[PDB]
Amino acid sequence: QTSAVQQKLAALEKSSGGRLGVALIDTADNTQVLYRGDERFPMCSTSKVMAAAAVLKQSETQKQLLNQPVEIKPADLVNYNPIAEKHVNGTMTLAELSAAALQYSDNTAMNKLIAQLGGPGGVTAFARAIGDETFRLDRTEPTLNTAIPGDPRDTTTPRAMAQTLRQLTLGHALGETQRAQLVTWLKGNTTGAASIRAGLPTSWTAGDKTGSGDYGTTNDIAVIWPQGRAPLVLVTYFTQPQQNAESRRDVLASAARIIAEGL
Numbered sequence: 001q002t003s004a005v006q007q008k009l010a011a012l013e014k015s016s017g018g019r020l021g022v023a024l025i026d027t028a029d030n031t032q033v034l035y036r037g038d039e040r041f042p043m044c045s046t047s048k049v050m051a052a053a054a055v056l057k058q059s060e061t062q063k064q065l066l067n068q069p070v071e072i073k074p075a076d077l078v079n080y081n082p083i084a085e086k087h088v089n090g091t092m093t094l095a096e097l098s099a100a101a102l103q104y105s106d107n108t109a110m111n112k113l114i115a116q117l118g119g120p121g122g123v124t125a126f127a128r129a130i131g132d133e134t135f136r137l138d139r140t141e142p143t144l145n146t147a148i149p150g151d152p153r154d155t156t157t158p159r160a161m162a163q164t165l166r167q168l169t170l171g172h173a174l175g176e177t178q179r180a181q182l183v184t185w186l187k188g189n190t191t192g193a194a195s196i197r198a199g200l201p202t203s204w205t206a207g208d209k210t211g212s213g214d215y216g217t218t219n220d221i222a223v224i225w226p227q228g229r230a231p232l233v234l235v236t237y238f239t240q241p242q243q244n245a246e247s248r249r250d251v252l253a254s255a256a257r258i259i260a261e262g263l
């Protein structure tokens with residue numbers, strides 16, 4: 001079946017010239033709305049939620065892990081390091097790295113999370129441990145953002161990422177204190193007002209993690225507390241046919257608005 005909402009998303013996609021993937025979970029009734037929900041998309045920085053969550057899981061058995069210092073060296077800097085460059089020849093704690101990765105999309109910070117987990121496969125292993133059979137992280141920053149059409153590296157599906165984000169932020173994949181920490185981090189994101197949240201009333205509370213990469217890849221994953229009802233989880237992924245395509249956060253906002261309309 002094709003619902004009215006799915007028809008509108010396809011219309012949006014046609015006008016956009018790219019490929020759009022959407023997955024909604026409404027936690028009031030657990031119902032789902034998907035558009036290309038089982039197609040793979042490059043995650044880009046939306047993968048940082050899984051990495052941060054994996055380190056939060058490690059911290060459940062190490063009370064001091066989030067305060068553990070990690071050395072930042074000049075050679076560690078990559079393409080986008082707004083927080084880590086302040087700490088070169090110094091240290092950042094794993095909490096500071098997590099916050100920088102999530103709230104500023106610092107890529108050096110992400111590489112330190114990946115290293116703490118033993119490499120990209122450590123992030124994938126955590127995904128599997130919490131029931132996500134789809135997620136895969138294969139590379140570090142910055143090459144995990146190449147976003148080449150047809151490449152399975154560093155991809156997931158909208159369906160899988162919505163389910164995982166629900167389990168991490170509203171369910172019991174993490175301990176209570178760690179879940180709260182992840183939600184606090186996402187709610188303090190600085191990069192998201194033009195993406196999913198631009199399509200929802202600005203008055204609704206939400207947290208999100210954006211992603212950007214080559215092929216004009218423009219992504220967002222969000223947990224949303226709408227006024228008067230149970231939270232939503234919403235994934236919007238978008239990627240374009242040209243390697244040097246421009247960002248299209250407006251397409252994510254438009255997808256979110258269509259979903260909101262549909263409630």
Ligand SMILES: *[B]([O])([O])[C][N]C(=O)/C(=N\OC([C])([C])C([O])=O)C1=[C]SC([N])=N1
Pocket residue numbers: 043044045046079080105107142145146210211212213214215
């Ligand atoms: B993540 O997807 O937010 C990390 N993003 C990147 O590394 C890319 N751009 O990030 C900045 C510079 C902050 C931006 O302009 O979006 C990136 C990697 S490949 C590419 N074309 N853009």
